[PDB]
C-alpha cells in the first residue's frame, strides 16, 4: 500500500492507523501547493479532490477520506480491536467519535489553514474551537482512551487534529485531560514511529 | 426508537434511513433556538452538543452524529443493501461518500446557516460550494445512485444536503446529473414519506 501524505496533516491519522494495523506500506509525500508527486505526476490524476490522505491499494484501488481509510484498515485486523465488530454498540460509538472529529474538529480548524479565509473571521473560528476543546476535555475525564478502555482509530484521529491546537496556539490552560491524552498517545511506539517518519 | 430532528436539517438523512430500514420510530421535534423539547426538557441534557440528529434507543442508549446513526441502522438490515458488508470494497466506497458529504458538503454549507458568519465571507463559501457541486455532478454522470447501481445511506445524506443548495439559491445551471438524482430520490416512496412527515 501507498499512503499519500503531508507531514502533520490529517493523513497522520491514517499513517498511525497503518502502523497500528501492522501493514506493509510506503509513504508518498505530496507537494500540495503544486499538486505534484516527486515523479512529476499531477496529483489531481490520483485524487481529483487534490487532498491527502489517499491510500492506493495494490489492486490499484484508490481510497480517499481519512475516516474511510481508517475503517478499511481496522476491519482488516479485527483482532487488534481498532474498531469493534458490526452490530455492536461499541462500534457505532467509535464511528460517532470519528464523525465528530472529522466534522467538528478537523473541519473546524480548516479555515485557519486556508488562503481564502478573511483575517477578521479567524477569532470567530478560534472561539468555536475553544468551546469544542472544552467538550473534548470533558469526554477525556476518565483518562483512558476516547472510547473508554480500548485504543481505537478514533484516538489516532483525535491526536492528529489536537496537535493542530498547539500549532495555532489555542489556549489549552485548564484542559488537563487533553494534556494527559496527548502524553499517553506519544508513549505508544507506533505513534512515535509515525511522528519520526514524518519528521515531527 | 426516537429521532430528535428539525424539518429539513441534516437529520432528514437519518429519518429517510429509518424509513428505508423499516424501523419503528417516533419523531421528536427540537426547538434549536431555545434548545427545548415540547415537554420543556433542556435538550442539552439529552445531547450535550445541542444538535440534531440524535437517536434514542429503547434501552436508553443515545447515538449522535448522522453518519454513525445511518451505519448503525443500515448494518441492522443487511439484506436491504443500504450499506455493503465489512471487507467489501463497496462498503468503503459508501463510507468514503458519507465522509465527503459530511465534511465537504454538510460542513461546507454550515457557515451560511450560522449567525457568527460575516457577510463578506458568504461569497467565498458559496464559491467553495460551487466547485464541490461540479465534482458531485460529475460523480453522478451515470445517473444511477452515488455509489453506482444500489441505493445506499450515502444517497439519503447527499439528497438531504443538496436540498440546501436550492434553499440558498446556488446556481445549479449545467448540473443536470444532480437534477436527475434529485428527481430519482423524490420518486422513492420512503423519501416521499419522510418529506411529508417533516412538512417539506
Ligand atoms: N474530507 C477529507 C479532507 C482531507 C483534508 O482536509 N486534507 C487537507 C489536509 S488536512 C489537504 O490535503 N489540504 C490540501 C489542499 O486541499 O490543498 C478527509 O476527511 O480526508
Ligand atoms: N457533526 C454533526 C453535525 C450536526 C449538525 O450540524 N446539526 C445541525 C443541523 S444540520 C444542528 O443541529 N444545528 C443547530 C445548532 O447547532 O444550534 C453530525 O454530523 O451529525
Question: Could you explain how this protein is built, in words?
Answer:
The structure is a homodimer of 200-residue chains. Chain A has 200 residues and is of the alpha+beta class. In chain A, strand 3 and strand 4 form a beta hairpin. Chain A folds into 2 domains: 94 residues, Glutaredoxin; 106 residues, Glutathione S-transferase Yfyf (Class Pi), Chain A, domain 2 (Up-down Bundle), CATH 1.20.1050. In chain A, helix 1 packs antiparallel against helix 5 and helix 3 packs parallel to helix 5. The first copy, chain A, has 7 helices and 4 strands; from the N terminus they run E-H-E-E-E-H-H-H-H-H-H. At the A-B interface, helix 2, helix 3 and helix 4 of A face helix 2, helix 3 and helix 4 of B. The structure holds glutathione (GSH) (2 copies). One glutathione sits at the interface of chains A and B. One glutathione sits at the interface of chains B and A.
Rounded radius of gyration of chain A (Å):
17 Å
- CATH class categorisation of the largest domain in chain A: Mainly Alpha
Domain module count of chain A: 2
Major sheet characteristics of chain A: 4 strands, mixed
Amino acid at each position: 500500500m501507498k499512503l499519500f501524505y503531508k507531514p502533520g496533516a490529517c493523513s497522520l491519522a491514517s499513517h498511525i492507523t497503518l502502523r497500528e494495523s501492522g501493514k506493509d506500506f510506503t509513504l508518498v509525500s505530496v507537494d500540495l501547493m503544486k499538486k505534484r508527486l516527486e515523479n512529476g505526476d499531477d496529483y489531481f490524476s490520483v485524487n481529483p479532490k487534490g487532498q491527502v490522505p489517499a491510500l492506493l491499494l495494490d489492486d490499484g484501488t484508490l481510497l480517499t477520506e481519512g475516516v474511510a481509510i481508517m475503517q478499511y484498515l481496522a476491519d482488516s485486523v479485527p483482532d487488534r480491536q481498532l474498531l469493534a465488530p458490526v452490530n455492536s454498540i461499541s462500534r457505532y460509538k467509535t464511528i460517532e467519535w470519528l464523525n465528530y472529529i472529522a466534522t467538528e474538529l478537523h473541519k473546524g480548524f480548516t479555515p485557519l489553514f486556508r488562503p481564502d479565509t478573511p483575517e477578521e473571521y479567524k477569532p470567530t473560528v478560534r472561539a468555536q474551537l475553544d468551546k469544542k476543546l472544552q467538550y473534548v476535555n470533558e469526554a477525556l475525564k476518565d483518562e483512558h482512551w476516547i472510547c473508554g478502555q480500548r485504543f481505537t482509530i478514533a484516538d489516532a484521529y483525535l491526536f492528529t487534529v489536537l496537535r493542530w491546537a498547539y500549532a495555532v496556539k489555542l489556549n489549552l490552560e485548564g484542559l488537563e485531560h487533553i494534556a494527559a491524552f496527548m502524553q499517553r498517545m506519544a508513549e505508544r511506539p507506533e505513534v512515535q514511529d509515525a511522528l519520526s517518519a514524518e519528521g515531527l
